Amino acid sequence: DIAGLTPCSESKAYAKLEKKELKTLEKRLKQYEADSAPAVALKATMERTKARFANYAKAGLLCGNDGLPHLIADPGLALKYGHAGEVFIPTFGFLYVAGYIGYVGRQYLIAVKGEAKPTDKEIIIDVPLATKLAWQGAGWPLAAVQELQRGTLLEKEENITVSPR
Amino acid sequence: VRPVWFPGNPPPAHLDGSLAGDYGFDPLFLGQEPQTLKWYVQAELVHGRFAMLGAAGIILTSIGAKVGLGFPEWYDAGKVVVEKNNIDFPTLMVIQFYLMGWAETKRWYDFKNPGSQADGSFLGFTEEFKGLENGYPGGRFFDPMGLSRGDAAKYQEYKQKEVKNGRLAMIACLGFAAQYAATGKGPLDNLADHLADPNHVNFATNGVSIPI
Amino acid sequence: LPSWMPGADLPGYLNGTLPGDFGFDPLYLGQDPVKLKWYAQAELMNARFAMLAVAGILVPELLSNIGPGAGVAWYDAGKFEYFAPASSLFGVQMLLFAWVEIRRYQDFVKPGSANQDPIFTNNKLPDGNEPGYPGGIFDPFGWSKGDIKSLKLKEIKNGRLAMLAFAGFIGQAYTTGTTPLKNLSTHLADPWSTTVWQNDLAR
Amino acid sequence: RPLWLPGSTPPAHLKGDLPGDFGFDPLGLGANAESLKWFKESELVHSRWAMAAVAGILVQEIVRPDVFWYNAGKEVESPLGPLGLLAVEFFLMHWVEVRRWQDLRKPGSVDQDPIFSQYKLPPHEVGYPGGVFAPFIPGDLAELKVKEIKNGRLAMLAFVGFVMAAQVTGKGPIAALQEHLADPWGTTIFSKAAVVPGQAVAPPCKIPASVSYKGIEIPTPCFLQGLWP
Amino acid sequence: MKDFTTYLSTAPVIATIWFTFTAGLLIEINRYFPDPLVF
Amino acid sequence: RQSWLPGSQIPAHLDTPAAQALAGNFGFDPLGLGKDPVALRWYQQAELIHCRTAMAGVAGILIPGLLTKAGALNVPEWYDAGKVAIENSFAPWGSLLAVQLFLCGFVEAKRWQDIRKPGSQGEPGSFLGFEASLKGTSELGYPGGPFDPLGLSKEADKWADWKLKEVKNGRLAMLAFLGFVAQKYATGAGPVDNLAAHLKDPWHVNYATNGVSLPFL
Numbered sequence A: 001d002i003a004g005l006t007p008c009s010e011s012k013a014y015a016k017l018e019k020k021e022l023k024t025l026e027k028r029l030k031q032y033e034a035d036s037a038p039a040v041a042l043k044a045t046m047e048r049t050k051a052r053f054a055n056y057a058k059a060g061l062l063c064g065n066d067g068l069p070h071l072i073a074d075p076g077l078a079l080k081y082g083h084a085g086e087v088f089i090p091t092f093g094f095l096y097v098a099g100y101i102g103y104v105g106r107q108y109l110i111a112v113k114g115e116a117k118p119t120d121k122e123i124i125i126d127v128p129l130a131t132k133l134a135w136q137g138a139g140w141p142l143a144a145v146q147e148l149q150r151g152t153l154l155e156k157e158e159n160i161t162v163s164p165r
Numbered sequence B: 001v002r003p004v005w006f007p008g009n010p011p012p013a014h015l016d017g018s019l020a021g022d023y024g025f026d027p028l029f030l031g032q033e034p035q036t037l038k039w040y041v042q043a044e045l046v047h048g049r050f051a052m053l054g055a056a057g058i059i060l061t062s063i064g065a066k067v068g069l070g071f072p073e074w075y076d077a078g079k080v081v082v083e084k085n086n087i088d089f090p091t092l093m094v095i096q097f098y099l100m101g102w103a104e105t106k107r108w109y110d111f112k113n114p115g116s117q118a119d120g121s122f123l124g125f126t127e128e129f130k131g132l133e134n135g136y137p138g139g140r141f142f143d144p145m146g147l148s149r150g151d152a153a154k155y156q157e158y159k160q161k162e163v164k165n166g167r168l169a170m171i172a173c174l175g176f177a178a179q180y181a182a183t184g185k186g187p188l189d190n191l192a193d194h195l196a197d198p199n200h201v202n203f204a205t206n207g208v209s210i211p212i
Numbered sequence C: 001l002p003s004w005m006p007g008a009d010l011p012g013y014l015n016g017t018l019p020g021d022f023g024f025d026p027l028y029l030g031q032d033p034v035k036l037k038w039y040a041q042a043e044l045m046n047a048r049f050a051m052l053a054v055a056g057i058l059v060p061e062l063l064s065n066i067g068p069g070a071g072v073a074w075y076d077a078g079k080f081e082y083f084a085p086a087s088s089l090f091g092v093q094m095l096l097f098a099w100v101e102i103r104r105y106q107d108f109v110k111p112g113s114a115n116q117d118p119i120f121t122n123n124k125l126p127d128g129n130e131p132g133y134p135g136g137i138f139d140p141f142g143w144s145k146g147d148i149k150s151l152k153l154k155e156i157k158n159g160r161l162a163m164l165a166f167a168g169f170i171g172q173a174y175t176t177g178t179t180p181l182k183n184l185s186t187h188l189a190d191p192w193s194t195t196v197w198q199n200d201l202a203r
Numbered sequence D: 001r002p003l004w005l006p007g008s009t010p011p012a013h014l015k016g017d018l019p020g021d022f023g024f025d026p027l028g029l030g031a032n033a034e035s036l037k038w039f040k041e042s043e044l045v046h047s048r049w050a051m052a053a054v055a056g057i058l059v060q061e062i063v064r065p066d067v068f069w070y071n072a073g074k075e076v077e078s079p080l081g082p083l084g085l086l087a088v089e090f091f092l093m094h095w096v097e098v099r100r101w102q103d104l105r106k107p108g109s110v111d112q113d114p115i116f117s118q119y120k121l122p123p124h125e126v127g128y129p130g131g132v133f134a135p136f137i138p139g140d141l142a143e144l145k146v147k148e149i150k151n152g153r154l155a156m157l158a159f160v161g162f163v164m165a166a167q168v169t170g171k172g173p174i175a176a177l178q179e180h181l182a183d184p185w186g187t188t189i190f191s192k193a194a195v196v197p198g199q200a201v202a203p204p205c206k207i208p209a210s211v212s213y214k215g216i217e218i219p220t221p222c223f224l225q226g227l228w229p
Numbered sequence E: 001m002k003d004f005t006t007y008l009s010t011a012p013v014i015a016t017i018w019f020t021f022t023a024g025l026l027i028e029i030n031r032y033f034p035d036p037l038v039f
Numbered sequence F: 001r002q003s004w005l006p007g008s009q010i011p012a013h014l015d016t017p018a019a020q021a022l023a024g025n026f027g028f029d030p031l032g033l034g035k036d037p038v039a040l041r042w043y044q045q046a047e048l049i050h051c052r053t054a055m056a057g058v059a060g061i062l063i064p065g066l067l068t069k070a071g072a073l074n075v076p077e078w079y080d081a082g083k084v085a086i087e088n089s090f091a092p093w094g095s096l097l098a099v100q101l102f103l104c105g106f107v108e109a110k111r112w113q114d115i116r117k118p119g120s121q122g123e124p125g126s127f128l129g130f131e132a133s134l135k136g137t138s139e140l141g142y143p144g145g146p147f148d149p150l151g152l153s154k155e156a157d158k159w160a161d162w163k164l165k166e167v168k169n170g171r172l173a174m175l176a177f178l179g180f181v182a183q184k185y186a187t188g189a190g191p192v193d194n195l196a197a198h199l200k201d202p203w204h205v206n207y208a209t210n211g212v213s214l215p216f217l
């Protein structure tokens, strides 16, 4: 497929690694009783192992010459060959939650600078104001591009600089 | 002057005796703020009214269950109602959360704004969802027989009786739960077992409550 | 003043100026006077088409039970020949009713503006316009002697009764699956075993 | 002014104005006047239905024996269908009840006959219409109202006694009275059931189970059977 | 009680509560959804 | 006034004379997205466009979907209609999408520049003869001229009612289309089939029983 990588459902070293991990787990299993708690724990481990290999072969992952899932990081190649759920959807999910955190922190800072004790609100957190901004920060990309388009996202050159600027 | 939960100690400053059931019992000082005490008064009333309602359900169902009427015991009643009728469990759960969330959200935003649910926005109703006190929403619906507006001293007596029976039913429901967790039986079965041998069938014979 | 429920409080915008003003508006649908104008005209139109509909369902079935080209039920009227397909008749119906309907609507928008015959420019309705109540050639037999009021109220009562009757015919025919005069014959044969509750619980 | 307990004091909202007022309100249910109007009307209506019911059960047992009045809805026969009788009762009672309720909520607003514009019922108090409802009166209203509420309270107690004596013994009121006249020491409610902290015994319900009507199997339970003895 | 909630409003206490909430939320997600690599 | 929650406080930006007179104002901005009035103007426009195309789309779902359960109009499902239509068509879907991108881009850019300046598309010379009828009607989002042929916008006393009926039917059609999407993924049948299944057994066929929407039960 991409870069000479076989799919994991077609790869043989993938099945070999699955069989090898099941073999290690059953070699650890065969020295206990039938209905004992280590036996139940190792059977749950084997169940999760089989379910994980079935889920990785189900999702269309690409395996290499060693039988391990490889990820594709190019928007067009992954959207073309159906690999968008491994980098592209995760990178926009991360940018949503990271900009969430940053926008809530920025709104807390601008909310506490307008008082007689900004540092005292920085040490001891105003919990109702923090929860209010935490719930209101779900529309952070819209509010971010609106603050970008008004010129209120940036401070002007009233910033602190050195004598050679 | 007034009877305190612990004779000899004075009551705290935030508990004056204006509240129903005000015995000065706040050793952890959970209600020093008046708004937090207001919220806890309403939470106490809601827990108490649910415990009275549920405890009367426990007692009536157990009376009907010991005598051979076919009633289940209360730890089996939900399973045998869902299985006897053709009721699916999650749809009845979601319908319960729908109706209860409607009513409880009305109560919530009437705590937040203390007269606001009688603006006529709900269907046409006005002053029938206006409250009277914190946790005392008597109008035409919630007080249809009209006892909160005549003989106000008798209404304070009913407030005292309501808080006392509610605390008694809360410790009764905790009793049913812990009682079944130890004995594994219905509660009036345990009452009959205590009436059989009082000196020998009690919590000092289970092996659970005192494991010595 | 007659109420739909004696002793009840009546809405203030209902004042007897309309025919059949009994104060019945529990959902407060006509607080706007403009909406009340539209609803009065729509009540007249739905009522008069319902009166013609209930006559056209009664009288052929009332004549088919006694001693004429077809004795077919009203809901099976589409599956009959009528010298032509129903589509061409639909087209003729929509053209001629587009003409008549748009002329009536232009009367309702501007009263006193749709009165005279456009081809034969001397034929004309008189100046007593009253949107919804044309007159002239629409009253050819010399009525409205008893002034206008009692006949308007009879008109709206027979019309509301026929609207309820047509909602009847649709419901009764959808439930019982049969013709309405045969349903009346079954109610007259044994009313105590043929109610709505009996036929509902018979399912 | 006689009282329910001679010697005590009536509640402050019970002056003695209404008929049958003997100062009996321990729960304080009549301290609201707007409630007390509704409860006076409801007391009169319950009392009149219960008087007519007790007279119906007594005349029904005297005139037509071997018909247990608790089985009157079951073993009646008529070419009148059950749903047709229930429909006639529904529409006619909905009519009468809504007329009376409109007189309640609007005092004196349904006095006039709707069909005939001649006949208007005279002005009155709520609960006591008069006119065609009272063509003949023996004596004065100020004593007959007291007689009416006394006979009515007594007949309400009589009807719940009929229901309990029918669910416990399975016999009519005259038959159960002859049972109590045969063995008075042995046929009482104390003589049939007892609860002691050892054990509890209750009478068996003489009404068996869900009663089979015409293919519907009406459930027929006995009133609060777990809390009986 | 006001001072106890002010102390609970301090920075290391809130950082402890919030990281306990965040770590517990991630732990419950990785329990009920074992081993997510894609989607 | 009317609110989405009786008792909650209305935000201060939705309680202004410029916001109270818009259409369908119920004080519903818990995320505070409309605090900037330029942003609230832009979001009014986006709401009107989503309302109108959601109504037109949901009508194209329902009326062919209701009439296909009646006699005429053998119409496929909306999640299958594009494939049957492109089998019956004359062009491939990419060419048709390119044509609709040019045709929609022209119109949308007209509306874009009319948002950026209200008195914009009434330049003389800019259009052959449609330049004088491509202005607004003093309220942006509500154009006149060739748009609105029947002249119903002319009457002033019905006008807030027409606006508020439009915004209520539009918000409701947006919920309808999002329900079409979710119902399509959870069940795999059509929306009229979902309505027939909820009418046949309501207490057993709903989203607590589909096994998708809340999988902890």
Ligand code: CLA
Pocket (backbone or CB within 6 Å): A074, A075, A076, A077, A080
């Ligand atoms: C971080 C830098 C970066 C690099 C080095 C690549 C590299 C590649 N891209 Mg990717 N891509 C990227 C980021 C990048 N991408 C970003 C940010 C986007 C969103 C705008 C895309 C969206 C995208 C699409 C839609 C496609 C690619 C494709 C490709 C491959 C060939 C492209 C080419 O020949 O043009 C020279 C490379 C560049 C100018 C680097 C920038 C890439 C731009 C954004 C897209 C170029 C697409 C190209 C014109 C289409 C070629 C068609 C192909 C059949 C020959 C190549 C592996 C194509 C592919 O799938 O090939 C198999 C393809 O169709 N990319």
Ligand SMILES: CC1=C[C@H](O)CC(C)(C)[C@H]1/C=C/C(C)=C/C=C/C(C)=C/C=C/C=C(C)/C=C/C=C(C)/C=C/C1=C(C)C[C@H](O)CC1(C)C
Pocket (backbone or CB within 6 Å): B025, B026, B027, B028, B029, B030, B047, B048, B050, B051, B053, B054, B055, B057, B058, B073, B074, B075, B076, B077, B078, B170, B171, B173, B174
């Ligand atoms: C005051 C104070 C103060 C200071 O500061 C501190 C301190 C001391 C800490 C505090 C104290 C506290 C306490 C004691 C608490 C307790 C509580 C409770 C117990 C509750 C319950 C509560 C309880 C409750 C609600 C309950 C309820 C119940 C119910 C509903 C039931 C139900 C049911 C029934 C019927 C039957 C069926 O079959 C089943 C069921 C479902 C099971």
Ligand SMILES: CC1=C[C@H](O)CC(C)(C)[C@H]1/C=C/C(C)=C/C=C/C(C)=C/C=C/C=C(C)/C=C/C=C(C)/C=C/C1=C(C)C[C@H](O)CC1(C)C
Pocket (backbone or CB within 6 Å): F028, F029, F030, F031, F032, F033, F034, F050, F053, F054, F055, F056, F057, F058, F060, F061, F077, F078, F079, F080, F081, F082, F173, F174, F175, F177, F178
């Ligand atoms: C307000 C606010 C504010 C605050 O601040 C916050 C918050 C809350 C967040 C917010 C909210 C929001 C929301 C809810 C939103 C939603 C939206 C939507 C749903 C849309 C849709 C929307 C929708 C839409 C457009 C749609 C449309 C549709 C269409 C066209 C369709 C089409 C079609 C058809 C016909 C058929 C064929 O076969 C195919 C197709 C092609 C498919």
